[PDB]
Coordinates of N, CA, C and O and ligand atoms in Angstrom, one line a residue:
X1 N 89.4 110.2 104.3 CA 91.1 110.8 104.1 C 91.6 110.3 102.6 O 91.9 110.9 102.4
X2 N 91.2 109.2 102.3 CA 91.8 109.2 101.0 C 90.9 109.6 100.1 O 90.0 110.3 100.5
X3 N 91.9 109.7 98.8 CA 90.4 110.2 97.7 C 89.9 109.1 97.4 O 89.2 107.9 97.6
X4 N 89.3 109.5 96.3 CA 87.5 108.2 95.8 C 87.4 107.3 95.7 O 87.7 106.2 96.1
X5 N 89.7 106.9 94.7 CA 89.9 105.5 94.1 C 90.7 105.1 95.6 O 91.2 104.3 95.3
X6 N 90.6 105.7 96.8 CA 91.0 104.9 97.8 C 92.5 105.5 98.1 O 93.1 105.0 99.1
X7 N 93.2 106.3 96.9 CA 94.7 106.4 97.2 C 94.9 107.5 98.1 O 94.3 108.7 97.9
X8 N 95.6 107.0 99.1 CA 96.2 108.3 100.0 C 97.6 109.5 99.0 O 97.7 110.2 99.4
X9 N 98.0 108.7 98.2 CA 99.1 109.2 97.1 C 99.1 108.7 96.0 O 98.9 107.8 95.7
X10 N 99.5 109.4 94.8 CA 99.4 108.9 93.8 C 99.9 110.5 92.7 O 99.4 111.2 92.6
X11 N 101.4 109.2 92.1 CA 102.6 110.3 91.5 C 102.7 109.5 90.4 O 103.1 109.0 90.0
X12 N 102.3 110.4 89.4 CA 102.1 110.4 88.1 C 103.4 111.0 87.5 O 103.7 110.8 86.4
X13 N 104.3 111.8 88.1 CA 105.4 112.3 87.7 C 105.1 113.4 86.5 O 106.2 113.2 85.7
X14 N 104.3 113.6 86.3 CA 103.8 115.0 84.9 C 104.1 116.3 85.4 O 103.1 117.0 86.0
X15 N 105.3 116.8 85.7 CA 105.1 117.9 86.3 C 106.0 118.3 87.3 O 106.1 119.5 87.6
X16 N 105.6 117.4 88.0 CA 106.3 117.5 89.5 C 106.9 116.3 89.8 O 106.1 115.2 90.1
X17 N 107.7 116.1 91.2 CA 108.5 115.1 91.9 C 107.6 114.5 93.0 O 108.3 113.5 93.7
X18 N 106.6 115.5 93.2 CA 105.5 115.1 94.4 C 106.7 115.2 95.5 O 107.9 116.1 95.9
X19 N 106.9 114.3 96.5 CA 107.5 114.2 98.1 C 108.8 113.0 97.6 O 109.3 112.9 98.7
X20 N 108.9 112.7 96.8 CA 110.1 112.1 96.3 C 111.2 112.4 96.1 O 111.3 114.1 95.6
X21 N 112.5 111.9 96.2 CA 113.5 112.6 96.9 C 114.8 111.7 96.4 O 114.3 110.1 96.7
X22 N 115.9 111.5 96.5 CA 117.0 111.0 96.6 C 117.6 110.4 97.8 O 117.5 111.0 98.8
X23 N 117.9 108.5 98.1 CA 118.6 108.4 98.8 C 120.0 108.2 98.7 O 120.3 107.7 97.4
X24 N 121.1 108.3 98.9 CA 122.3 108.3 99.0 C 122.1 109.2 97.6 O 121.6 110.7 97.9
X25 N 124.2 109.4 97.1 CA 124.5 110.6 96.6 C 123.6 110.5 95.0 O 123.9 111.4 94.6
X26 N 123.2 109.5 95.5 CA 122.0 109.8 93.7 C 120.7 111.3 93.4 O 120.9 111.9 94.7
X27 N 120.8 110.8 92.2 CA 119.8 112.3 91.9 C 118.6 111.8 91.2 O 118.4 110.6 90.7
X28 N 117.4 112.0 91.8 CA 115.8 111.7 91.2 C 115.4 113.4 90.1 O 115.7 114.6 91.1
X29 N 114.9 113.0 89.1 CA 114.2 114.2 88.4 C 113.1 113.7 87.4 O 113.2 113.0 86.6
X30 N 112.3 114.5 87.4 CA 111.2 114.4 86.3 C 112.0 114.0 84.4 O 113.7 114.5 83.9
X31 N 112.2 112.9 83.9 CA 112.8 112.4 82.8 C 111.1 112.1 81.7 O 110.3 111.3 82.2
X32 N 111.7 112.8 80.6 CA 110.3 112.4 79.5 C 111.1 111.4 78.4 O 110.9 111.1 77.7
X33 N 112.0 110.8 78.9 CA 112.8 109.3 77.7 C 112.0 108.4 77.8 O 111.1 107.8 76.9
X34 N 111.2 107.9 79.0 CA 110.3 106.5 78.7 C 109.3 107.4 79.6 O 108.8 108.0 80.7
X35 N 107.7 106.5 80.0 CA 106.8 107.0 80.7 C 105.6 105.9 80.9 O 105.7 104.8 79.3
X36 N 105.0 105.8 81.5 CA 104.3 103.9 82.2 C 102.9 104.6 81.5 O 102.1 103.9 80.3
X37 N 102.6 105.5 82.5 CA 101.6 106.8 81.9 C 102.1 108.4 81.7 O 103.2 108.6 82.2
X38 N 101.6 108.8 80.8 CA 101.8 110.5 80.6 C 103.0 110.3 80.1 O 103.3 109.3 78.8
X39 N 103.7 111.4 79.8 CA 104.2 111.6 79.4 C 105.7 111.4 80.0 O 106.9 111.8 79.4
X40 N 106.1 111.3 81.3 CA 107.0 111.3 82.2 C 106.6 110.5 83.4 O 105.6 109.5 83.8
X41 N 108.1 110.2 84.1 CA 108.3 109.2 84.8 C 109.6 110.1 85.2 O 110.3 111.0 85.3
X42 N 109.7 109.4 86.5 CA 110.7 109.5 87.9 C 112.2 108.8 87.3 O 112.3 107.7 87.2
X43 N 113.4 109.5 86.8 CA 114.1 109.3 86.6 C 115.1 108.9 87.8 O 115.6 109.8 88.5
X44 N 116.1 108.0 88.3 CA 116.9 107.7 89.3 C 118.5 107.6 89.2 O 118.3 106.8 88.3
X45 N 119.2 108.4 89.3 CA 120.7 108.2 88.6 C 121.9 108.9 89.7 O 121.4 109.4 90.2
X46 N 123.1 109.0 89.1 CA 123.8 108.6 89.9 C 124.6 108.0 90.6 O 124.6 108.2 92.0
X47 N 123.6 107.0 90.7 CA 123.9 105.9 91.9 C 125.4 105.5 91.4 O 125.6 105.0 91.4
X48 N 125.9 105.5 93.4 CA 127.4 104.5 93.2 C 127.2 103.3 93.8 O 127.9 102.5 94.3
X49 N 125.8 102.3 94.2 CA 125.8 101.5 95.5 C 124.5 101.6 95.0 O 123.6 101.9 95.1
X50 N 123.9 100.0 95.3 CA 122.4 99.4 95.0 C 121.7 99.9 96.1 O 120.9 99.9 95.3
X51 N 122.4 100.7 97.5 CA 121.7 101.0 98.5 C 121.0 102.3 98.0 O 119.6 102.7 98.6
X52 N 121.3 102.8 96.7 CA 121.0 104.2 96.4 C 119.9 103.7 95.6 O 120.0 103.2 95.0
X53 N 118.8 104.5 96.1 CA 117.9 105.0 94.9 C 116.4 106.1 95.0 O 116.9 107.1 95.7
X54 N 115.3 106.1 94.9 CA 114.0 106.9 95.6 C 113.4 106.4 96.6 O 113.2 105.6 97.2
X55 N 113.3 107.4 97.6 CA 112.1 107.8 98.7 C 112.0 108.8 98.6 O 111.5 109.4 98.4
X56 N 110.7 108.6 99.7 CA 109.3 108.9 99.7 C 108.8 109.1 101.6 O 108.3 107.7 101.5
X57 N 108.9 110.0 101.9 CA 108.4 109.9 103.4 C 106.6 109.4 103.8 O 106.3 110.1 102.7
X58 N 106.3 108.7 104.8 CA 105.1 108.4 104.8 C 104.6 108.8 105.9 O 104.5 109.1 107.3
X59 N 103.6 110.2 105.8 CA 103.0 110.6 107.0 C 102.7 109.9 108.2 O 101.3 109.1 108.0
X60 N 102.8 109.9 109.3 CA 102.2 108.7 110.3 C 100.6 108.9 110.7 O 100.4 107.5 111.4
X61 N 100.0 110.3 110.1 CA 98.6 110.2 110.4 C 97.7 109.7 109.6 O 97.0 109.4 109.7
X62 N 98.2 109.5 108.3 CA 97.7 108.6 107.4 C 98.3 107.6 107.1 O 97.2 106.8 107.7
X63 N 99.4 107.0 107.3 CA 100.0 105.2 107.0 C 99.8 105.0 108.9 O 101.4 105.5 109.5
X64 N 99.6 105.2 109.0 CA 99.2 104.6 111.1 C 100.1 103.4 111.1 O 99.4 102.3 110.3
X65 N 101.0 103.5 112.0 CA 101.6 102.1 112.0 C 101.2 101.0 112.8 O 100.1 101.3 113.5
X66 N 101.5 99.6 112.7 CA 100.3 98.4 112.7 C 99.4 98.2 112.1 O 98.2 97.0 111.9
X67 N 99.1 98.5 111.1 CA 98.3 98.6 110.3 C 98.5 98.1 108.7 O 99.7 98.7 108.6
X68 N 97.2 97.6 108.4 CA 98.2 97.4 106.4 C 97.6 98.2 105.7 O 96.6 99.1 105.3
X69 N 98.2 98.5 104.4 CA 97.9 99.4 103.0 C 98.5 98.8 101.9 O 99.1 97.9 102.3
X70 N 98.1 99.4 101.2 CA 98.4 99.4 99.8 C 99.9 99.9 99.2 O 99.5 101.1 99.1
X71 N 100.7 99.4 98.4 CA 101.3 100.3 97.7 C 101.7 99.3 96.4 O 101.9 98.1 96.7
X72 N 102.4 100.9 95.1 CA 102.2 100.4 94.2 C 103.7 101.1 93.6 O 103.3 102.2 93.6
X73 N 103.8 101.0 92.6 CA 105.0 101.5 91.3 C 105.5 100.9 90.4 O 105.1 99.4 90.5
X74 N 105.5 101.6 89.3 CA 106.2 100.3 88.4 C 107.6 101.2 88.0 O 107.8 101.9 87.7
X75 N 108.1 100.3 87.8 CA 109.7 100.6 87.3 C 110.1 99.9 85.9 O 109.3 98.8 85.7
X76 N 111.5 100.6 85.8 CA 111.8 100.2 84.2 C 113.6 100.8 84.7 O 113.9 101.4 85.1
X77 N 114.3 100.0 83.4 CA 115.9 100.5 83.2 C 115.8 100.7 81.8 O 115.0 99.6 81.0
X78 N 116.8 101.2 81.0 CA 117.3 100.9 79.8 C 118.5 100.5 79.8 O 118.4 99.9 78.7
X79 N 119.1 101.0 80.3 CA 121.0 99.7 79.9 C 121.2 100.0 81.6 O 120.9 100.9 82.3
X80 N 122.3 99.7 81.2 CA 123.1 99.2 82.2 C 123.4 97.7 82.7 O 124.7 97.3 83.3
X81 N 122.4 97.1 82.2 CA 122.7 95.6 83.2 C 121.4 94.6 81.7 O 121.0 95.1 81.3
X82 N 121.7 93.1 81.6 CA 120.7 92.8 81.6 C 119.1 92.2 81.9 O 118.4 91.8 81.4
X83 N 119.7 92.3 83.7 CA 118.3 91.7 83.9 C 118.6 92.4 85.5 O 120.2 93.2 85.7
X84 N 117.6 93.3 86.2 CA 117.7 93.7 87.5 C 116.7 93.5 88.4 O 115.6 92.9 88.1
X85 N 117.0 93.2 89.7 CA 116.1 93.4 90.9 C 115.5 94.6 91.5 O 116.3 94.8 92.2
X86 N 114.7 95.0 91.0 CA 114.1 96.4 91.7 C 113.6 95.5 93.2 O 112.5 94.4 93.3
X87 N 114.0 96.4 94.3 CA 113.2 96.4 95.6 C 112.2 97.8 96.0 O 112.6 98.6 96.0
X88 N 111.0 97.2 96.4 CA 110.6 98.5 96.8 C 110.3 97.9 98.6 O 110.4 96.6 98.9
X89 N 110.5 98.8 99.4 CA 111.0 99.2 100.9 C 110.0 99.9 101.9 O 110.4 100.8 101.2
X90 N 110.5 99.2 103.3 CA 109.7 100.2 104.2 C 111.3 100.6 104.9 O 111.9 99.5 105.4
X91 N 111.5 101.8 104.6 CA 112.8 101.8 105.5 C 111.8 102.7 107.0 O 110.8 103.4 106.3
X92 N 112.1 102.6 108.1 CA 111.7 102.6 109.1 C 112.7 102.8 110.1 O 113.9 102.1 110.1
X93 N 112.4 103.8 111.1 CA 112.8 103.6 112.7 C 112.1 102.5 114.1 O 111.0 102.4 113.8
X94 N 112.7 101.6 114.3 CA 112.6 100.7 115.2 C 111.9 101.4 116.6 O 112.6 102.9 116.9
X95 N 111.4 100.7 117.4 CA 111.0 100.9 118.9 C 112.4 101.4 119.6 O 112.4 101.8 120.5
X96 N 113.7 100.6 119.1 CA 114.9 101.1 119.6 C 116.0 101.9 119.1 O 116.6 102.7 119.9
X97 N 115.4 102.8 118.4 CA 115.6 103.9 117.5 C 116.5 103.8 116.4 O 117.5 104.1 115.7
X98 N 116.7 102.0 116.2 CA 117.2 101.9 115.3 C 116.7 102.0 113.6 O 115.5 101.2 113.7
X99 N 116.8 102.3 112.8 CA 116.6 102.3 111.4 C 116.8 100.6 111.0 O 117.9 100.3 110.9
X100 N 115.5 100.4 110.4 CA 115.8 99.3 109.3 C 114.9 99.1 108.0 O 113.9 100.0 107.8
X101 N 114.7 98.1 107.3 CA 114.1 97.7 106.5 C 113.1 96.7 106.8 O 113.8 95.7 106.7
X102 N 112.2 96.9 105.8 CA 111.2 95.6 105.6 C 110.6 95.6 104.4 O 110.6 96.7 103.3
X103 N 111.3 95.3 103.0 CA 110.2 94.4 102.0 C 108.9 94.6 101.9 O 108.6 93.7 102.7
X104 N 108.3 95.2 100.7 CA 106.8 95.3 100.6 C 106.9 94.0 99.4 O 105.8 93.8 99.2
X105 N 107.8 94.1 97.9 CA 107.5 94.2 97.1 C 109.0 93.6 96.2 O 110.1 94.5 96.3
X106 N 109.1 92.7 95.4 CA 110.3 92.9 94.6 C 110.1 92.2 93.5 O 109.4 91.1 93.0
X107 N 110.8 92.7 92.0 CA 111.0 91.9 91.0 C 111.5 92.4 90.5 O 112.8 92.9 90.1
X108 N 112.0 91.0 89.4 CA 113.2 90.8 88.1 C 112.1 91.3 87.3 O 111.2 90.7 86.8
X109 N 113.0 91.7 86.0 CA 113.1 92.0 85.0 C 114.1 92.6 84.3 O 115.3 93.0 84.7
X110 N 114.0 92.6 82.7 CA 114.6 93.0 81.7 C 114.7 94.2 81.0 O 113.8 95.3 82.0
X111 N 115.8 94.6 80.4 CA 115.9 95.7 80.0 C 114.5 96.4 79.2 O 113.6 95.6 78.4
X112 N 114.0 97.8 79.5 CA 112.9 98.3 78.5 C 111.6 97.8 78.7 O 110.9 97.7 77.5
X113 N 111.6 97.5 79.6 CA 110.3 96.9 80.0 C 109.6 97.0 81.6 O 110.5 97.4 82.7
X114 N 108.5 97.7 81.7 CA 107.8 98.0 82.7 C 107.7 96.9 84.0 O 107.2 95.8 83.7
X115 N 107.8 97.0 85.2 CA 107.6 95.6 85.9 C 106.6 96.5 87.1 O 107.3 97.4 87.3
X116 N 105.7 95.6 88.0 CA 104.5 96.2 88.8 C 105.0 95.6 90.1 O 105.2 94.7 90.2
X117 N 105.5 96.9 90.6 CA 106.1 96.4 92.0 C 104.8 96.7 92.9 O 104.2 97.7 92.7
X118 N 104.3 95.8 94.0 CA 102.7 96.0 94.4 C 102.6 94.8 95.7 O 102.7 93.9 95.2
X119 N 101.8 95.9 96.1 CA 101.5 94.3 97.8 C 100.6 95.3 98.2 O 100.9 96.3 99.0
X120 N 99.0 94.9 98.1 CA 97.7 95.5 98.6 C 97.7 95.0 99.7 O 96.5 95.8 100.6
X121 N 98.5 94.6 100.5 CA 98.4 93.8 102.3 C 99.7 93.7 102.6 O 99.8 92.7 103.2
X122 N 100.2 95.2 102.9 CA 101.8 95.3 103.6 C 101.1 96.1 105.1 O 100.5 96.6 104.9
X123 N 101.8 95.2 106.0 CA 101.2 95.4 107.3 C 102.7 96.3 107.7 O 104.0 95.8 107.5
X124 N 102.1 98.1 107.8 CA 103.5 98.5 108.9 C 103.6 98.4 110.5 O 102.8 98.0 110.4
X125 N 104.8 97.8 110.6 CA 105.3 97.1 112.0 C 105.1 98.3 112.7 O 104.6 99.2 112.3
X126 N 103.7 97.7 114.2 CA 104.2 98.6 115.2 C 104.8 99.8 116.0 O 104.3 101.3 116.1
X127 N 106.2 99.4 115.6 CA 106.9 100.5 116.1 C 107.7 101.0 115.5 O 108.4 101.8 115.9
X128 N 107.3 101.2 114.4 CA 107.8 101.9 113.3 C 107.7 103.7 113.5 O 106.6 104.1 113.7
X129 N 108.5 104.0 113.1 CA 108.6 106.0 113.1 C 109.6 106.2 111.8 O 110.1 105.7 111.8
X130 N 109.3 107.3 111.4 CA 110.3 107.8 110.9 C 110.4 107.6 109.7 O 111.1 106.8 108.8
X131 N 109.1 106.9 109.0 CA 108.9 105.4 107.9 C 108.8 106.3 106.1 O 108.9 107.5 106.1
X132 N 109.8 105.7 105.6 CA 109.6 106.3 103.9 C 109.7 104.9 103.2 O 110.1 104.0 103.5
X133 N 109.1 104.9 101.9 CA 108.9 104.5 101.5 C 110.1 104.3 100.4 O 110.2 105.2 100.0
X134 N 110.7 103.5 99.8 CA 112.7 103.5 99.6 C 112.1 102.1 98.2 O 112.2 101.0 98.3
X135 N 112.9 102.9 97.2 CA 112.9 102.0 95.8 C 114.5 101.9 95.6 O 114.9 102.8 95.3
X136 N 114.6 100.9 95.5 CA 116.6 100.5 95.0 C 116.2 99.2 94.2 O 115.4 99.2 93.8
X137 N 117.4 98.9 93.6 CA 117.9 97.8 92.9 C 118.3 96.9 94.0 O 119.0 97.3 95.1
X138 N 118.5 95.7 93.3 CA 118.5 95.0 95.0 C 120.9 94.4 94.2 O 121.5 94.6 96.2
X139 N 121.1 94.6 93.1 CA 122.8 94.4 93.2 C 123.5 95.3 92.0 O 124.0 94.3 91.4
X140 N 123.2 96.5 91.5 CA 123.2 97.5 90.8 C 123.4 98.4 90.7 O 122.9 98.7 91.8
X141 N 123.9 99.4 90.1 CA 123.9 100.7 90.1 C 123.5 102.1 88.8 O 124.0 102.8 88.9
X142 N 122.6 100.8 88.4 CA 122.0 101.1 86.7 C 120.9 102.7 87.0 O 120.5 102.4 87.8
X143 N 120.9 103.4 86.2 CA 119.9 104.5 85.7 C 118.3 103.9 86.2 O 118.6 102.4 85.4
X144 N 117.3 104.1 86.2 CA 116.0 103.4 86.5 C 115.3 104.6 86.7 O 115.2 105.4 86.8
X145 N 113.7 104.2 86.2 CA 112.5 105.0 86.2 C 111.4 104.7 87.1 O 111.4 103.0 87.0
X146 N 110.9 105.4 88.0 CA 109.6 104.5 87.9 C 108.9 105.9 87.5 O 108.9 106.8 87.4
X147 N 107.4 105.2 87.8 CA 106.1 105.8 87.6 C 104.9 105.4 87.9 O 105.0 104.1 88.8
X148 N 103.7 106.5 88.5 CA 102.8 105.7 88.8 C 103.0 105.1 90.4 O 102.3 104.1 91.1
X149 N 103.3 105.9 90.9 CA 103.5 105.7 92.8 C 102.6 105.7 93.6 O 102.5 106.6 93.1
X150 N 102.3 104.6 94.0 CA 100.9 104.7 95.0 C 101.1 103.8 95.9 O 101.1 103.3 96.5
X151 N 99.6 104.9 97.2 CA 99.9 104.4 98.9 C 98.6 104.6 98.6 O 98.2 105.7 98.2
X152 N 97.9 103.3 99.1 CA 96.1 103.4 99.4 C 95.9 102.8 100.5 O 96.9 101.4 101.0
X153 N 94.3 102.5 100.5 CA 93.7 101.7 101.6 C 94.0 100.2 101.5 O 94.3 99.7 100.4
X154 N 94.4 99.3 102.7 CA 94.6 98.1 102.0 C 93.6 97.5 101.4 O 92.5 97.4 101.0
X155 N 94.2 96.3 100.5 CA 93.4 95.8 99.2 C 92.9 96.9 98.3 O 92.6 96.5 97.3
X156 N 93.4 97.3 98.2 CA 93.1 98.5 96.9 C 93.3 97.5 95.5 O 94.3 97.1 95.8
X157 N 92.8 97.4 94.9 CA 93.6 97.2 93.5 C 93.6 97.8 92.6 O 93.2 98.8 91.8
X158 N 95.0 97.7 91.9 CA 95.3 97.8 91.1 C 95.9 97.4 90.0 O 97.1 96.3 90.2
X159 N 95.6 97.5 88.9 CA 95.9 96.6 87.5 C 98.0 96.6 87.1 O 98.5 97.5 87.3
Ligands
CA201 CA1 104.1 109.5 84.5

């Protein structure tokens, strides 16, 4: 079911936001201000809390709970702080019907520099439903950009 390169989803943000939406009162939109690949990335703005960010639903048919998968996205920011800590996380619902977050990867970086959020061997909890991959920063509300968001078979190598 994955593509040639073992990718289940691959969002370049070149003309489309894919299944990506905003979390919180924020807004996500295509932007040509900066890009990692191509001419555009996804801009995340109007954040008022750190927990605000960008998210994308995961199909339970494709991403089977209890199994391992590779997730990757590149992120950067331009202004608002001297540094930040990006978090890519799994937002999901557990066996008790309560929403939880599980960290997939996190990276600290300065302004104007792409950083690679990456985990080729992330295990999705077995009791997980209503899953979303979720990107945010740890402790601020700056605008930020993401590009090349990928979800792939476990062990997939992304440089
Ligand atoms: Ca792009």
